[PDB]
């Protein structure tokens, strides 16, 4: 599930690095 806000904010930050 991608609907965990914590999973999304974490999903989005690694894509910087």
């Amino acid at each position, epitope marked *: 599930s991608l609907w965990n806000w*914590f999973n999304i*904010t*974490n999903x*989005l930050w690694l894509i910087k690095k």
Partner: antibody
Amino acid sequence: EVQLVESGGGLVKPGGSLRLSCSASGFDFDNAWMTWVRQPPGKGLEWVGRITGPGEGWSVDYAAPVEGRFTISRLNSINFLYLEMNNLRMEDSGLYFCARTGKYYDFWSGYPPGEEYFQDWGRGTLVTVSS
Amino acid sequence: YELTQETGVSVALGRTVTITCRGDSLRSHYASWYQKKPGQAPILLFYGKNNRPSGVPDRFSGSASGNRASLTISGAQAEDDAEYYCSSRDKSGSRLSVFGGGTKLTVLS
């Protein structure tokens, strides 16, 4: 359009218990994050705890001096937020608010899990704890 | 409280004033400001990088630099005499939120 009404507050002996209720209307209550915030007398605001939406499995985070004693729950069917309080101390006084928590996270500068802001508030209900 | 504000700041009528909020977590996280009047519910004034909610006048503006977050009120009016609190994460990467010591704005009307 957004409406918030707290209730269930009053006087109570130390170590006692009390359950505060909060009704909501004028928005999508089922997916909205909710947060309880208190203001001790003569002092400023103090973050109590937050209940999440369906996407997070209704997970609940409490404060350090609060956890292990309080319990937050919600009824999306009747749109009611509840704050169960056990082993009440005198420091838990006096006023309690419920607020509609928003979610913010800038992609280029934000840091997970981002930040939480509060869009709407209620009048709050007074909870006095004395012996 | 790991977020620190001014105890009390005063300002003349129709002039600019800037309150600040200090904390280690602010280096990684933004801060949201709220106006508090006695016997009244708080009101969201500003949050994030540059987001002002509707209904809030344009004289309220926020900023962030290092471990400090500031709220500037250019041309403060008489009714701005109130209490203000900044909210953010307690620690860098924490799921918990926390407010500041609170600042009393004294508008000499």
